[PDB]
Amino acid sequence: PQITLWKRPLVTIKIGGQLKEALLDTGADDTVLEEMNLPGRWKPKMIGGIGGFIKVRQYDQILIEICGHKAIGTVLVGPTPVNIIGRNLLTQIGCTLNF
């Protein structure tokens, strides 16, 4: 679909079998989700954005469906204020900016 930006581009996602609301974020290199339980091994990582750094758990090769489009890639889980879908997954669903 074509999504205007008068409101936050929030969409429903499905990960680990659970439905969530997440932000399509072209300003994010990575995908970071709020604290949750995901199966599989993880590695402790840290990312620094505006405001400082946070500790996250990196899950690789995680299935995630974004607005009906499937993706498999790296998902970070930690104390992020909002579920963020980053460019690593936005590219997989064929997302582009257009004006």
Place this chain on the structure above:
Amino acid sequence: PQITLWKRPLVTIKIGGQLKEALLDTGADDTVLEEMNLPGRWKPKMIGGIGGFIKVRQYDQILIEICGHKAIGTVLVGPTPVNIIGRNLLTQIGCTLNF
């Protein structure tokens, strides 16, 4: 134009007589630019990122040219590591997400 998301969507902007590189960020409600000396009145503001908040100066009705597309609105200025073009200005240049 159409901008893929394989790399950071960075584009050239013109503000206050200066040319700069800025990030088209659908995950940013507002626009925040690296520290610069804009004239006129301003109001303090704090904006939240992934790691916390930073203090910025809010300037209203500031003209910015984004890829040749003009826009006028609120521009925040503060210790941001990256120039960020937010939804308040992306809407003005007719920017959409498409997949």
